[PDB]
Amino acid sequence: KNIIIGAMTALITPFKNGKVDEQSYARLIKRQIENGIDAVVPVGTTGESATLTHEEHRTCIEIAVETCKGTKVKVLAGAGSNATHEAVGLAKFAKEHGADGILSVAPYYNKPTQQGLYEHYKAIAQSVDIPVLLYNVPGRTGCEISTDTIIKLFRDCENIYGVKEASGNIDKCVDLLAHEPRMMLISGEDAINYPILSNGGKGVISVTSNLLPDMISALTHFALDENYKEAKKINDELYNINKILFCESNPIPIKTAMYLAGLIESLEFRLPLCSPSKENFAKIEEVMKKYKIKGF
Amino acid sequence: KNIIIGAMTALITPFKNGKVDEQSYARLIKRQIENGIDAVVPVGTTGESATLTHEEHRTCIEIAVETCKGTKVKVLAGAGSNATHEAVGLAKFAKEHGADGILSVAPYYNKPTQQGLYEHYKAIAQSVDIPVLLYNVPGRTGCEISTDTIIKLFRDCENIYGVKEASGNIDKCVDLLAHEPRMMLISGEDAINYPILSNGGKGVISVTSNLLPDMISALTHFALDENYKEAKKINDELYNINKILFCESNPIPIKTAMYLAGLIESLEFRLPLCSPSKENFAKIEEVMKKYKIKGF
Amino acid sequence: KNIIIGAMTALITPFKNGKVDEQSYARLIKRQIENGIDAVVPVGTTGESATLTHEEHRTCIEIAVETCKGTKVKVLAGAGSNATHEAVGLAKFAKEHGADGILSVAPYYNKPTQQGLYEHYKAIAQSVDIPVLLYNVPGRTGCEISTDTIIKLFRDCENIYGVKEASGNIDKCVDLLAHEPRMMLISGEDAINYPILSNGGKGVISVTSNLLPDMISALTHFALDENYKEAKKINDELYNINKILFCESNPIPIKTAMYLAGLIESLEFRLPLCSPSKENFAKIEEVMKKYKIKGF
Amino acid sequence: KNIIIGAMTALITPFKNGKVDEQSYARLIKRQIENGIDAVVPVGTTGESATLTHEEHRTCIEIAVETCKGTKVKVLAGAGSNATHEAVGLAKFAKEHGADGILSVAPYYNKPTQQGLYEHYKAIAQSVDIPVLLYNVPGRTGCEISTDTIIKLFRDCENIYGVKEASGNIDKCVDLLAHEPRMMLISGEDAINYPILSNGGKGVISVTSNLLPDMISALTHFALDENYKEAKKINDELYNINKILFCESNPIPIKTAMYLAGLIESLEFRLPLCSPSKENFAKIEEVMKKYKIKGF
C-alpha cells in the first residue's frame, strides 16, 4: 500500500477582502515545510472547506502542490463532500493536478448508513489511483464510520490506507489496530496525539501545527522513533494550547492565534464562521505567550 | 409578521436514472394538494438537498411553485446551506421565482457559534422580503440554534417568523414559546407532532405526510381547531409508522415506503444514500399494512 | 387497577442539627394539603433518600401517613432501591404502615438489564397489594426502564399502574400511552408538566410544588379538566423557576428556595450534597421574586 | 505519598443459595495472588457493592485482608457510597481491619456538585490515614469528578493519591497527568488499559483479570517497564474478551465467564442483577475459547 504518514497540518485558509489570500497561503505552507512537517492538508475542516467555492477549493489544492514541489513534503488534498458525485469530482481533480493523496471526510448532514458509507468511499477510491485517507469526525458530520466499515474499505479497496480519527474514542483506536494492524491510523485530535501514536498510530493531521509546526513535528517524529518519553512531554506541554484552540469551533481559535502571532494579515472568516468572543480572544492570547511561536 | 403555518410536507425528491424525475415530482406534489396539505417544502433534508446540484435544487423549487399555482398551497422552499453566500443565493432565487417563503437549515459540519448563526440568518433575512423559517436539527448538523438566538432573530429580523424544530426536546419548545409566544413553532419530528402542536405549535413540516398526507393534514387541523382529543388520536395511530420511517436515515425509509406503495417508479437515492437493509425493508413493509395509503 | 394520580409533591426533607426536622416535615406536608395537592411523596430523590438511614427513611413515611390521615391527601411513599431486597423491605414497610402506594426508582449504579428490571419490580409488586408506580430517571440511575419493560410490567402485575417519567423524552411519553393507554403516566420533570399532561399523562410528582404548591396543583387540575389553555399558561409562567431549580442538582436549589422563603429553619443538607454556589444562590433568590410564595 | 499501584483485580463476589460463598471468595483471591496480581479490590462495582449488606461488605473486606497476609498483594478495599456518612464508616472499617488502602466510587444517584464531591472525599480522606483512590465512573453514577476536583483533592489531602478512571475519555487522562503528573492514574476500563498506562498511568483495576489474571498482570508490568510493544500486544490480544465482558452490564458477563470456566460453582447474582441472555451466554462462551484460562 502507498501511504502518507508523519506530522501533517490541516492548513488554515487565509482570507483578505473576502477572497483567498493566495500569497499568504503559499507563505504559510513553506513555513510548515521549514519546520519539519511531512505533509499538508489543503481545505480540510480547518481550511473552511464548507464556504470555499469548488473553484477556490481547487485553487488551494494547486497552491499546496506548487509550494511543496521540490521538497519531501507530500500533499494530502481535502476532497470530501456529503455528495458522492461531489467527492468523486474533488478526488479526480486532486489526482490530475499532482496531489500525493486525498483526505475525504465522512458525509455530513445527510447521514448515510454504513452500507452507504462503503459505497461512497468505494466510488471515491475507484475514482483515482492515489492513496485515500478516511476522515471520521462524528461531532461535525452526524455520522460515524464504524470500525467494521473502515476495516472493510481498507481490505476491499487498494488505495484506502487508513483513517484520520477525530472522535476522542481511544477504544475505537485500539479496536481498529487490534483487528487491522496494517492500517495507518491518523490523529485528528491534537490533545490526544501521543496516546494515538503510542498505540501504533503513524501520524497526525494537526490544527495546532498551524501555529507550532516544529513542536508537532518533534512530537510525531519522537513518537514514530518510539521515544515515548519525549513525545509524551511535548504532548503534555501542548495540552493547554491544544484545548484552547477549541474554546470555540475550529478553526476560529487557530485563525485568531495565527493572527495574534502576526502570521496572517487579517482575522477574517467566511460566514457563518466569525471572530471569537472578546473573552475567548483574551484566553487564546493568554495561552499563546507561554509557547514560542516561529515566524516566517 | 407574514407566516406560513399548518400541515406541510418535506417532499421526497423522486429521481429516475440518476436524474430528477420532474414529472413524478409534479404528480407527488399535487397528491399532497389533494389531501389537505397547507404547504410544501421542496428540497429539505428529506428531499436530499445535499446531493442535488444547485441547478436541480432550483429546478425543484420552480416545479413546486408551478404545481401549487391555482391553489391555496404555499411553497416554503428549502434554501439552507452551511455557507452563508450559498444560503443567500438560494433565498434570492426562491424570492425571485415565486416561493412564498424559505426554510433555512442551520449550517451543518462547520458548527458556527451562536454569534455566527445570528449573522448567518440576518444576512439571509435581509437578502429577501419573504418569510424565513429557521430549522434546527442538531443531530444532522452538529450545531444547535439556542433559544436566545432564535428569539433574537425573531425580534431583530422582520421576516424571521419561527423555527422548524427537529430536536426531540420538548423542554426547548416550552422555553421558546414561553419566552416569545409570538413565534411560529413548527414540528420537524412526526412522532411528537401532537405534543408540539398541543403546546402552541402552529404546524408541522412532515416526513410522514409524503406517504399519509391526509392523516397529517387531519392531525394538524384538528390541533389548530383545538380539538386536542382527535389530534392526539391520530398522533397515537401514526406512532408506529412515524418511528419506523426512521429505522434508517431519513429519507431512506420514506422513499422505500413510497416505492412499496407504488407512489414512485424507482427505489432511487443518490450516494451516499442507498437502499435499506433487507430486514428494515421488510419492517417498513409490515408497518405500512396497518395504514390506508392514498393514491394519486 | 387502583391508582394514585393528580398533583403530587416530592417532599424535601428538612434537617436541623443533622437530624430530620420531624416537626418541620409535618408542617410542610400540611401546607401542601392546604394548597390543593392530591398526594405527597416522602423520601423521593427530592427527599435525599440516599443519605437518610433506613430508619429515618421509615420515619418520614410514618409522618406523611399520620399527617395525611383524615384529609384528601394520599401518601405515595418513596420505596426504591438499587438492591431488590432493600426495595422489597421498604415496600412492605410502606404497606404495613398505611401508605396508599409506593414510588420505586429504577436501580441506580449497578445498571441492571431489562430482564433484571422486570424481575426487580415483579418482586416488589408481589411483596405488597397497594399501587406501585415505576420511576424512570436515567440521568441519575444510569439505566432506563424501556418502554416495552414498563408496559410488560404494567400488564403482568396488577398493582403496577404507571410510571413517573423523568427522562426529558416526550417521544417516549407518546410511545407509552399510544401502545398502553391505560397506564398512569406521571410527570417527573416540572418544566414539561403540561406537554406530558396534554398527551394523556394523569399527574405530576413535582419538585417546584414544594415552593409553589398552589400553582402546580392548579396546573395539573386545569390539564386533567382539559383546560389546556390555562394549564399551558401556568406551565409557561413557571418555566423560569422550573429551570432555575436545576441550576444545581435537585434538591439543592429547592431547599435553597424553601429556606429563602422562610419555609425551613436552615439550609442544611447531608453530604455529599451541599449549599449552592454564591452565583446560584442569588439566581434562585431572584427568580423567586417573580412568583408569589404561599405561607403556612 | 504511599500508593497502591500495579495490576489489580476488582473481585467478583460469588454467591451460593443467596449467601456470600466465603470459601469460594478466598480461593478466588488466592488464585489472583498466584497469578502476578498486585492488589485485589473487594466489593467494587464488579463485586456487586450495591446488593451486599453493610455486614457482608465488611465480611468480604476482611477475607481479602486475611487471604493476602504474608504476600506482597495489597488490599484496596471498596469503600464507596453515595452517602458520606456511609462512605466514612466503610473507610474507617477498612483502616481498622488491616486494609492497605481504599477505593471510593463517586456518589451515584444523588449527583453531588463539584464542591460536594470535594467535601465528600475530604471527609473520607481525613477519617483515616491509609491511601485513598478516587473512582470516577460517570456512566454508572450520573456525575463526574472533574479534572480540577481530582487535582484539588490530590494536592489538598495527604492520602488521596490517584484516581481509577472508567470514563472512556483519554483526553481527560492526558489532562490529569499533564497538569498533575504526581498522581497515580489507574485504568478502570480493560479495553484501553495500555493507552492509559502508555500515558503515565501506573496500574489497572481490571475486570478481565478475574478470568485472565496472568495476562492482565503481564500487560501491566510490561507497560510499567516501558515495554510498550509487549504491553500493546497483550492489550490487542485481550480486546475481544475485554469488550465481550460488557455485552451486558458488568459483572453479569465476567461472572458468566467465571462460571463457564468452572471457577465458581453457581451462576448466581443478586437481583436486580440476573443471568445473561441465551445469546450473550453463547457469545461469552465463544469468545472464551480464544484464551487460555488458568485453574486453581
Ligand SMILES: N[C@@H](CCCC[NH3+])C(=O)O
Ligand atoms: N457548502 C458545501 C459546498 C462546498 C464547496 C466545496 N468545498 C459543502 O460544505 O459541502
Ligand SMILES: N[C@@H](CCCC[NH3+])C(=O)O
Ligand atoms: N453537497 C453540498 C452542496 C449542495 C447544493 C444544493 N443543495 C451541501 O450539502 O451543502
Ligand SMILES: N[C@@H](CCCC[NH3+])C(=O)O
Ligand atoms: N445510600 C444508600 C442507602 C439508602 C438507604 C435509605 N434510603 C442508597 O442510596 O441506596
Ligand SMILES: N[C@@H](CCCC[NH3+])C(=O)O
Ligand atoms: N444498595 C445500597 C446499599 C449498599 C450498602 C453496602 N455497600 C447502595 O448501593 O448504596
Ligand SMILES: [Mg+2]
Ligand atoms: Mg530517528
Ligand SMILES: [Mg+2]
Ligand atoms: Mg471543533
Ligand SMILES: [Mg+2]
Ligand atoms: Mg450530477
Ligand SMILES: [Mg+2]
Ligand atoms: Mg433548508
Ligand SMILES: [Mg+2]
Ligand atoms: Mg466498572
Ligand SMILES: [Mg+2]
Ligand atoms: Mg522490570
